[PDB]
Amino acid sequence: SGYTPEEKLRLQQLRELRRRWLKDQELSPREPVLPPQRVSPVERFWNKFLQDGALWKNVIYKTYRHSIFAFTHVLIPVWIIHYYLKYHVTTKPYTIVEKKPRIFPGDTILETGEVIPPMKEFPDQHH
């Protein structure tokens, strides 16, 4: 109860066009024809400085990538944040409210110099 002769031909005829079409869906070696692209000298130095494998120098290359990221994305923002916090946020009352440090027995205060007497003798035992 398979295909009637017409159906077998039509499917064959369709597949003949179908696979021709799918072959047209391939890019020639020259594609895409990207417009001319400017390459910065800083990029040129790395492409020429890396070239071959030279795994030893990649650590220098990676350190450059991390140093750049650790500078623009960490050091610069913490300057902006710190300047904002130190001279603008903290000049107004109760903008940053800390929790007063815990004071344990037998400690001296840096500011006032007070000493808190230790606790009473412990009637403790071994174990």
Binding site: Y84, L85, E98, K99, R102
Partner: protein, 221 residues
């Protein structure tokens, strides 16, 4: 204090950099997934510095840097509570997200919109950190709904799949029913305690709390 507060906010500000640069300030599509991952990597290191200080001397502070809106006797600020719950969860969340994004670079390597997938993943992380560090109820609500809306977009990632849309809208429906309780809590605290700040809610310490806490339980449900 300066180092603790400065390093607490830098973690949050760092995560927004990939979003800001996504406005065509540095066009490197092929490297954006690695750019986002490395940002999460440093956010973990930065968060550990205030995390360690809490472990050592139990330091803890609030940061109300910005004044947004004063409705008569209710003052709304962009406050941040860096305490036990936030200090421990921030490193954990960033550490786990770090591994997920690195895993997702390989897993989603064949997706045409991988760049748009990492921006959404980073948007959720920003909403969650707002939710975790919120000091007043309104700011918490911003993150509360923010995570809810990114879930809608990420669940329905393959949007030609009707079952993905159905699952996406289903999440909004159930979480919307929960948001009824959250607004119930906000109305109670303002009406009775005259505030949305957690510092003032605890200081007054109301006795009768069935209604406001019943609402929160529905929000958590």
């Amino acid at each position: 204090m300066n180092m603790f507060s400065s390093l607490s906010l830098v973690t949050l500000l760092l995560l927004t950099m990939p979003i800001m640069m996504m406005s065509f300030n540095t066009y490197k599509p092929s490297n954006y997934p690695l750019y986002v991952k490395t940002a999460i990597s440093y956010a973990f290191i930065t968060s550990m510095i205030p995390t360690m200080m809490f472990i050592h001397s139990g330091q803890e502070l609030i940061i109300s840097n910005w004044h947004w809106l004063t409705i008569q006797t209710l003052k709304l600020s962009l406050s941040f509570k860096m305490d036990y719950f936030s200090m421990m969860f921030i490193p954990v969340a960033l550490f786990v997200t770090w591994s997920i994004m690195e895993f997702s670079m390989w897993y989603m390597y064949s997706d045409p919109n991988i760049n748009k997938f990492f921006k959404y993943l980073l948007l959720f992380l920003i909403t969650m950190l707002i939710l975790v560090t919120a000091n007043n109820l309104f700011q918490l609500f911003i993150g509360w709904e923010g995570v809810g809306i990114m879930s809608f977009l990420l669940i329905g990632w393959w949007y030609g799949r009707a079952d993905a849309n159905t699952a996406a809208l289903q999440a909004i429906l159930y979480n919307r029913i929960g948001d009824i309780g959250f607004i119930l809590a906000m109305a109670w605290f303002l009406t009775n305690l005259n505030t949305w700040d957690l510092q003032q809610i605890f200081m007054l310490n109301p006795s009768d709390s069935n209604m406001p806490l019943i609402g929160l339980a529905l929000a958590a449900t």
